[PDB]
Amino acid sequence: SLYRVLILNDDYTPMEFVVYVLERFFNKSREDATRIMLHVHQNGVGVCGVYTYEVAETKVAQVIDSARRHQHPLQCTMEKD
Numbered sequence: 055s056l057y058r059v060l061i062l063n064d065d066y067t068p069m070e071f072v073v074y075v076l077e078r079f080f081n082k083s084r085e086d087a088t089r090i091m092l093h094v095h096q097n098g099v100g101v102c103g104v105y106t107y108e109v110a111e112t113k114v115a116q117v118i119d120s121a122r123r124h125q126h127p128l129q130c131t132m133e134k135d
Contacts, residue, residue, distance in 0.1 A: 057110035
């Protein structure tokens with residue numbers, strides 16, 4: 055059973071940081087990171103990647119840790135895929 059990692063839109067986190075997160079933690083190409091960031095901006099939520107449960111939890115935690123240490127409120131969660 056695999057799990058999708060999601061990021062949520064907000065009106066505080068810079069677009070460029072979201073792209074950075076997608077490239078750093080989810081192995082996204084520049085183009086794919088840009089498109090996912092924009093999809094989240096437009097739709098409120100988007101999929102970052104799909105992993106086993108414990109790896110998805112790891113990615114969520116790494117994103118939250120990174121975001122808060124960069125002074126951004128970016129929300130990240132996971133759901134069964």
